[PDB]
C-alpha cells in the first residue's frame, strides 16, 4: 500500500511538473521604486508582549491581545482605549474581530476560545459563550457574527457555531500542528497552514481537502490570502515567503534574500496585492514586490520581534504589534 | 458643533482606562511567573504548593503548568520567554531529560532564563563513564553523577543564567522556600550582571 501511495504521488508530481515562475513572464514590467513609511502613531499602552492584533473591518478600530491578561480595543485616529477587556486565560495566542464590528475572540494555551460582547446594553463587557479541543488554539476568524473557524495545535481545524456551541463541521488530516489560517474574501474556502510544510487548502461546506500543497522546508508560521482569491502567500521558518497558487497546484515564485536567515512570523498583502509585507525575526519588517521579488523598503522600527501584522480593508495603514508592548501604525 | 461631545465621551474612557491600568500594573509587576515543564510534579506542585498560585513573604507566584498540553514543544514554549525561572522536575529515561534540557538551554528565545532544577529521584549499563568519575557511596555516586552531568550541560553556553540543582524526595514540607530563596538569587544576579558589578 505504501508503494501504491508512492506511485500515486509520483503521478501527482509528474502532473504538477507537466502543468508548469512568474518572473520570466513579468520581467520588463515597470518596477515600483523605493518606498518608506514612518510611524504616524505609537499605540504605547500595553504591559507585556503583544502577540496578535486583528485589524478591524471598520478600518478604524483594532483589537490587540497581549499575554499581560488584557485585551484592549484600540483606536487608530485619536489613540484611545475604547475598552479594556480582561481575560481569565492569562495567555492569548490570537484575537479575532467580527466583520460587523460586533464581536471579539480570544483564547490560547488554556485550550478554550471565548467570545466577548462589546455592543452590550447593561454596562460591563461579559463573555458570551465560551466553547470547547485537546491542545492550544492558535487562531480564530469570523465568517459572520456567529461562525468561527478556529485552528488548533490539536492538528484539527474545527468550524464552530456559537449558537448552542457545536462543531457544525470538523476538519482533520494534517498530522502536525496547525499554526495559521486565512479566509477567502467571498468566504467560501480557506487555506490552513501547518507544521509539516503543508499548506493544505480546505472547503468550508463539505469538510475535506480540495488541493493540498507541500513546498517548504520547515514549519509554516503564518499564511495569507490574495485580495481576489486565486492566490495565497505563505511564510515559513527558513526565512522564505513562497507565493503559492490554488489554480495550478504549485507555486509561482519564491521570496528569499541570502542576506537574512530567520523565521517569518506574520504575512499580509496590500489592497492591490502589490506589496507583500512580512514580519521577520531580526526585528525589521521587509516589503516584497508582487511579481518582481526584491526587498524594497525595510520598515525597521521595533526592538524585540514582530509578532503580527495587518493591513486595513482599504489599504491605508499597516500596524505591527511587536513583543515589547508597543504597537506602531505605519502609513 | 454637535461633534464636540463625542470628544469628551471618548476622553473620559481614555482617562478611566489610564487610571485602571496604572492600578493593575502594580499587581502585574509584583507577581513573578514560573513554569513546571519536564514532567508533571504531583509531588512538588499539588501536595506541597492551569495556574496554581501561592505566596511566601507577601509575594505571589503564578506557578503555571503544562501537564495537559501536547508533546511537540517547539511552539508553545517560545511564548514563555518572559518568565523568571523555569522549574524543572525530573526523575533510556535520563537521556531524554538531558536532551530536553540541552534544547531548552541552547534555545534562542528561552536563552536568558535561569533554569531551576529538581532531582525528584532521590545505571552503569546505560552509562559507561560511571567508573571513570569520582567526586555509603552507593547513592552518592549516582546522585552526584547525574547532577554533575546536568551541570556539565549547563556550564558550556554567557553567564546570564545558571542551573540551581536541588534534591528532594521526602514529604517536601519546606519545598517552597527552596524556590523562594532560590528565585531571589535570580533577581539579584540579573541586577548585578547588569550593573557591570559581578
Amino acid at each position, epitope marked *: 500500500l505504501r508503494q501504491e501511495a508512492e506511485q500515486l504521488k509520483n503521478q501527482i508530481r509528474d502532473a504538477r511538473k507537466a502543468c508548469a515562475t512568474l518572473s520570466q513572464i513579468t520581467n520588463n514590467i515597470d518596477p515600483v521604486g523605493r518606498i518608506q513609511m514612518r510611524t504616524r502613531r505609537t499605540l504605547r499602552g500595553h504591559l507585556a508582549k503583544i502577540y496578535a492584533m486583528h485589524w478591524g473591518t471598520d478600518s478604524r478600530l483594532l483589537v490587540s491581545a497581549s499575554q499581560d491578561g488584557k485585551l484592549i480595543i484600540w483606536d487608530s485616529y485619536t489613540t484611545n482605549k475604547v475598552h479594556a477587556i480582561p481575560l481569565r486565560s492569562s495567555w492569548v495566542m490570537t484575537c479575532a474581530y467580527a466583520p460587523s464590528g460586533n464581536y471579539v475572540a480570544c483564547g490560547g494555551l488554556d485550550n478554550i476560545c471565548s467570545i466577548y460582547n462589546l455592543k452590550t446594553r447593561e454596562g460591563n463587557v461579559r463573555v458570551s459563550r465560551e466553547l470547547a479541543h485537546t491542545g492550544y488554539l492558535s487562531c480564530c476568524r469570523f465568517l459572520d457574527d456567529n461562525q468561527i473557524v478556529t485552528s488548533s495545535g490539536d492538528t484539527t481545524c474545527a468550524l464552530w457555531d456559537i449558537e448552542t456551541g457545536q462543531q457544525t463541521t470538523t476538519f482533520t488530516g494534517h498530522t502536525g500542528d496547525v499554526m495559521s489560517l486565512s479566509l477567502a474574501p467571498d468566504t467560501r474556502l480557506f487555506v490552513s497552514g501547518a507544521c509539516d510544510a503543508s499548506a493544505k487548502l480546505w472547503d468550508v461546506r463539505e469538510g475535506m481537502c480540495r488541493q493540498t500543497f507541500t513546498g517548504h522546508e520547515s514549519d509554516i508560521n503564518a499564511i495569507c490570502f490574495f485580495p481576489n482569491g486565486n492566490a495565497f502567500a505563505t511564510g515559513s521558518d527558513d526565512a522564505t515567503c513562497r507565493l503559492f497558487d490554488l489554480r495550478a497546484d504549485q507555486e509561482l515564485m519564491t521570496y528569499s534574500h541570502d542576506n537574512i536567515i530567520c523565521g517569518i512570523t506574520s504575512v499580509s498583502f496590500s489592497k492591490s496585492g502589490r506589496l507583500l509585507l512580512a514580519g521577520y525575526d531580526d526585528f525589521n519588517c521587509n516589503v516584497w514586490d508582487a511579481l518582481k521579488a526584491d526587498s524594497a523598503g525595510v520598515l525597521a522600527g521595533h526592538d524585540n520581534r514582530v509578532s503580527c501584522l495587518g493591513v486595513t480593508d482599504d489599504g491605508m495603514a499597516v500596524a505591527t504589534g511587536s513583543w515589547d508592548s508597543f504597537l506602531k501604525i505605519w502609513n | 458643533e454637535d461633534q464636540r461631545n463625542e470628544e469628551k465621551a471618548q476622553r473620559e474612557a481614555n482617562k478611566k482606562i489610564e487610571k485602571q491600568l496604572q492600578k493593575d500594573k502594580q499587581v502585574y509587576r509584583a507577581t513573578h511567573r514560573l513554569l513546571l515543564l519536564g514532567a508533571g510534579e504531583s509531588g512538588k506542585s499539588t501536595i506541597v504548593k492551569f495556574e496554581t498560585k501561592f505566596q511566601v513573604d507577601k509575594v505571589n507566584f503564578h506557578m503555571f503548568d503544562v501537564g495537559g498540553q501536547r*508533546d511537540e514543544r*517547539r511552539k508553545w514554549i517560545q511564548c514563555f520567554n518572559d518568565v523568571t525561572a523555569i522549574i524543572f522536575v525530573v526523575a533510556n529515561r535520563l*537521556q531524554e531529560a538531558l536532551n530536553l534540557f540541552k*534544547s531548552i538551554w541552547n534555545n534562542r528565545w528561552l536563552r536568558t532564563i535561569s533554569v531551576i532544577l529538581f532531582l525528584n529521584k532521590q545505571i552503569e549499563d546505560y552509562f*559507561p563513564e560511571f567508573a571513570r568519575y569520582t567526586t555509603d557511596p552507593r547513592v552518592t555516586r549516582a546522585k552526584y553523577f547525574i547532577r554533575d552531568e546536568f551541570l556539565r550541560i549547563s556550564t558550556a553556553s554567557d553567564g546570564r543564567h545558571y542551573c540551581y540543582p536541588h534534591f528532594t524526595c521526602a514529604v517536601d514540607t519546606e519545598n517552597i522556600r527552596r524556590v523562594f530563596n532560590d528565585c531571589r538569587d535570580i533577581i539579584q544576579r540579573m541586577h548585578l550582571r547588569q550593573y557591570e558589578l559581578l
Partner: nanobody
Amino acid sequence: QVQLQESGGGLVQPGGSLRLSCAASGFTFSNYKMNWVRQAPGKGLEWVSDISQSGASISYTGSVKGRFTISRDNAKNTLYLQMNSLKPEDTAVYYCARCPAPFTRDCFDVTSTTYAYRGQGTQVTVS
C-alpha cells in the same frame, strides 16, 4: 516535498557491522542538524546519535559510545551511521530523523508520533 529514506540493515549475529545510509532531498542539506533515532519493538522511541551541521560536534547516548560512528556528507546529501560490535539489545527500527529549524542548536524531534521530517526507517536486529 522533503524525502528522508534509508538503506542497509537486516539480520546479523553479534559482533557484526552495519553501515546505514539516509537519502535526503528536497531541502538544502548543508545547514540542518541531523540525528538518528531507534525504536525498540515493544518500547517507546529512544535516542542513539546526533551530529552538528559541519560534522564537528558529534555526540552519542550512554551505552553506544565508541562503538558506532556517525558522519554526514554535505555534498552527496547522505548521513551514514556505521555500526560496529552489536549486542543482544540493539534490535530496533532506525529512523533518520532531523531537527525543525535551520541554523539551530536544539532538537525537539524524539516524539511519540506526528513528525514530518522522520523517515520510514529500516529494521536492524541481532540473532
